[PDB]
Curated annotation (Swiss-Prot), chain A:
This is Small ribosomal subunit protein uS8. Belongs to the universal ribosomal protein uS8 family. It comes from the Bacteria. NCBIfam families: PRK00136.1. GO terms for cellular component: cytoplasm; cytosol; cytosolic small ribosomal subunit. The keyword Repressor applies. One of the primary rRNA binding proteins, it binds directly to 16S rRNA central domain where it helps coordinate assembly of the platform of the 30S subunit.
Curated annotation (Swiss-Prot), chain B:
The keyword Acyltransferase does not apply. The lineage of its organism: Bacteria, Pseudomonadati, Pseudomonadota, Gammaproteobacteria, Enterobacterales. One of its GO terms (cellular component) is cytosol. This is Small ribosomal subunit protein uS12. CDD domains: Ribosomal_S12 (cd03368). Gene3D superfamilies: Nucleic acid-binding proteins.
Length: 129, 122
RNA sequence: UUAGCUAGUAGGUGGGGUAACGGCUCACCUAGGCGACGAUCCCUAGCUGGUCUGAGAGGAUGACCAGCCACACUGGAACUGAGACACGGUCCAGACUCCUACGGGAGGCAGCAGUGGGGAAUAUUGCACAAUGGGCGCAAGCCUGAUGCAGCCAUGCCGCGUGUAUGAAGAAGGCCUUCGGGUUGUAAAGUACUUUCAGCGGGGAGGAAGGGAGUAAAGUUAAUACCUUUGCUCAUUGACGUUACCCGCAGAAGAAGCACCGGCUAACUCCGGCCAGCAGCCCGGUAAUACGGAGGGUGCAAGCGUUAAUCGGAAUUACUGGGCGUAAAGCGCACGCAGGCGGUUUGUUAAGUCAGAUGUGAAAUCCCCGGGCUCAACCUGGGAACUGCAUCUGAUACUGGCAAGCUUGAGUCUCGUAGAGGGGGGUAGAAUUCCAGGUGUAGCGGUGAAAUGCGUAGAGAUCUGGAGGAAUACCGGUGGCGAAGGCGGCCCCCUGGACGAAGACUGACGCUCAGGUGCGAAAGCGUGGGGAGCAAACAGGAUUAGAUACCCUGGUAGUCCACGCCGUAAACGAUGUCGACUUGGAGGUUGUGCCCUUGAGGCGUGGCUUCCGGAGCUAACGCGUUAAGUCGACCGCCUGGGGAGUACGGCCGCAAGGUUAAAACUCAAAUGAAUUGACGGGGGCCCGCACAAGCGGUGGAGCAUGUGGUUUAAUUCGAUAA
RNA sequence: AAUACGUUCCCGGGCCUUGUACACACCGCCGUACACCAUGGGAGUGGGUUGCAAAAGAAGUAGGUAGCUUAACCUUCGGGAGGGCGCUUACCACUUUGUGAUUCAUGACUGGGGUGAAGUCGAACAAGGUAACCGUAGGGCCUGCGGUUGGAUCA
RNA sequence: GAGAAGGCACGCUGAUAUGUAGGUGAGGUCCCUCGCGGAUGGAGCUGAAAUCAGUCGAAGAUACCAGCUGGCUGCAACUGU
């Protein structure tokens, strides 16, 4: 059954990017909206909107540059079968700093460099390169 | 394997079995020559390989090769064996030439230390 | 391939006991406690800081140095003491060794040397308490195999030396040579110079602080004695030791070896028969860079190699960091407990998580900057590090707990649909066989051909009636149903699942699942039936060199039924289950909705299903929305080929056997896909005196000629499409 | 001179396609005498370790004590308290018995396995000449039943 | 298989308890649809087994009474005749 909706969101983004989809839709969630915010403010997706009240539907507008995928790689790091938590001195850097690592710190969901500047660690949600 | 399957049963490191088990982690072992004879090689090769059977001090009875050209080895000869197989199936040890019963190969001038030959003084 | 263990056992009350809590012990009472997070049992093992390796994570390891523990011939016990159940104490028992006047005694090197033994292997029966430390003492001092040193060993690390400069037509000899020469090779000889280290002789620190005897000052005291502290003076304190270091002498004089040279791997020539031999993994059958020797060269160098052992390379146990369609690997299928994971919102907690601080993380070691040994090894100052644990204070995003929700996952209800889904009973027709009879006559049957076999006692053929069992032609179809195995005439009775339409309902009730349980083709087993056809075994006839086979004639078990067992299949999609996402085309089957329904119509929308194919993936073949694509959860499984799914042990079975499941040993391969050929007692097409149609021969005779064989002194040598 | 209808068969060749475990390439691999090595079973045989039920009871410690003895303390000088030895009980080591468990070595004989230029007799790979293989059963590999394609050819 | 094998305890006296647990059950009391009744009640009687302590003997199942045990194997299944 559906036991990891965040990995499902990442997989939907990856499959819509590989299929040259204009936008991807999925059931919404607070954590999904936070991760979509982190992706949009970093420039990996164009925009996102949440429609519906009793069954919210999250819709991400995918991004392309030269007819090519803006999101080259997106992986789930911390997963239900194995949780990955990191301290602020061992936060990972993707693509030697060119990529981002979505980290869930006690001050919300943010990137790895934002969590480093804030002096925080937490759960490594995903890698986006 | 799933992380849970490894938690329940971890990885089992493959154990390596020795190729010279009669030495018992010793560089050399002493033994008495039970029977000295010759053997024919295997397939491609064709010769009469000089070999001997030796009961070691730890009770092991093994067949050991006698390198070099010519040897004066009879039964009840107490020799020193070392690892090193002969590619002669079954033989897995070499006899140290120049070790307390096996005289060095006479008329050696090159690679003498491998056959226990004293340096010829000018 | 050890699943149950435990009777002082678990707890309680009370007495005792200990320095101290305590089943530590006793009496009684309660009936517990440990265990799948591995109790119990078995094998191995001192633990740590650390060491080796590794980029790291890890793997291996625990010698020296330091901390902890245990032991002191073996077993037991206590005594003294602050501390022991005591290496150089006590008592007892045992084994052993020794003294004895035979009555009794004595001893414990796993302290330092040392001996015998074992082993491949590990050293002196040395000097001094001079320094540090220890015991005793007011002190002097005595004791100290701790310790400081020395002896032996290339065992390791580090440093230095075995000379330096010049030196040719390039001497001799050696090796090679196309015989020109080349190389060894400035290498040598010769000449000039030098003397580190070793050898002989002469100087010479530092490790030395103290302690002693004197006086002087201060304190104490009634005292200018004695004592304590503090200055100064004098004579001394070194095992190492002939020290380190320095100076002088003489003379190249005393000092280079080991391995390798086919590829991996730096380094090539000559000479002597698959033998001798080499080999870490892939040479030698008469011009071997692979054997052995020589010349030359290469690499290390007071060392060099071989062996043994650990890690690396090995991503080859893959946490970092692997796989399971065909290379090893998806349980035959399903239900399901423990376990793992879990949609979405709010509040709360702060367990995981994160942040800060405190304590700790012994010293040494590792690393960084310096210092001292002439440098280095080594020693050492300071720092960093010790990635860990605990506590305290906060954060609340995520995971978890708690409380309340929500409907989209999961189920319930309503109405229908399709179906070889299952169990029970009945019945129908075609056909085979058999029994009886009629007609009828010489064959039938079978085969490549035959024969065995049946038949003149009337077969086979045909017609009529009857009996019995088994399976259900056509429909029928890369069609349907079922978790899988499987399910096929028609009818009735009982019964499970799936799907669709529109709603209502519950509100995470879910997914997966070790062990467990259930179902599980065929064959096989047990009991009782049944038995037409077919047909293991079996018999005969053929074929054949043989034919325990294929072929033929029969034929028992079995196949069939009821009830049990078996639990295995190429149980296959060689593809575990569940969920999400990702271009298409043509069909099949089964619902449902819309439209003058034009039509057996068109357009949507579900379920299952077949073929092709795009991106992607793959070693390739191929898979491709029913993935072998992109992901998530859980489970099973794999770690080279044999030995071997075997042996032993356990469980199961009536048995056959099933299941779990190694080891020694042995090889450098085993394997998958695809490629070029070759071949086929595979296919298609086509040629040739290839066959067919003919004519003339050869093989028989005599002779000519060549060969083989034999003979010989030789019957010269070669040719075997000879 | 004869004869040739024709390509069904023998041989050799050419082209294409298919299968292959062949590649000094079809004149190309399996299972039942000899030698060696490791190993299972095996009447037993000898050891190690260990469980249970007992017997035993040195020294020591502790409880009890009428026998012997006894400096400190008390006393009425008679003794007393206390102590010690001896005896005894409890615990307990060695040791002894009986019966099991497990491990090692061993054993007449026996079952397979592996290895070894060169021995004897004759299934797979092509449609391998009866397609192969899987489970099962019966008989110096074949046959029956079921299953798979990891079978070739199909005017 | 098995009573496998093997082992331990065993007399007497006292105490627990002037004789216990248990068995039996009077009087009494109560009820009764009344009798050879029911309930309660416990007097009296009887009485193991065990534990602890003591004690005698060379010996406590003391006499009579009352399995020998184990291992390998042939044959027959067995009780029977």
């Amino acid at each position: 059954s559906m036991q990891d909706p965040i990995a499902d969101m990442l997989t939907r983004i990856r499959n819509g990017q590989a299929a040259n989809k204009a936008a991807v839709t999925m059931p919404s969630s607070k954590l999904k909206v936070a991760i979509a915010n982190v992706l949009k403010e970093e420039g990996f997706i164009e925009d996102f909107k949440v429609e519906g009240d009793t069954k919210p539907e999250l819709e991400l507008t995918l991004k392309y540059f030269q007819g090519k995928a803006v999101v080259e790689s997106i992986q789930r790091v911390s997963r239900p079968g194995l949780r990955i938590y990191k301290r602020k001195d061992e936060l990972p850097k993707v693509m030697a700093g060119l990529g981002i690592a979505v980290v869930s710190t006690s001050k919300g969901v943010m990137t790895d460099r934002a969590a480093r500047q804030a002096g925080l660690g937490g759960e490594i949600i995903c890698y986006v390169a | 394997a799933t992380v849970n399957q490894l938690v329940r049963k971890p990885r089992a490191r493959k154990v390596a079995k020795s190729n010279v088990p009669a030495l018992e982690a010793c560089p050399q072992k002493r033994g008495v020559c039970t029977r000295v004879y010759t053997t024919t090689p295997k397939k491609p090769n064709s010769a009469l390989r000089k070999v001997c059977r030796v009961r070691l001090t730890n009770g092991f009875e093994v067949t050991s090769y006698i390198g070099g050209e010519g040897h004066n080895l009879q039964e009840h000869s107490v020799i020193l064996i070392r690892g090193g197989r002969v590619k002669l199936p079954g033989v897995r040890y070499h006899t140290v030439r120049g070790a307390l019963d096996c005289s060095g190969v006479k008329d050696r001038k090159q690679a003498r230390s491998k056959y226990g030959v004293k340096r010829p003084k000018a």
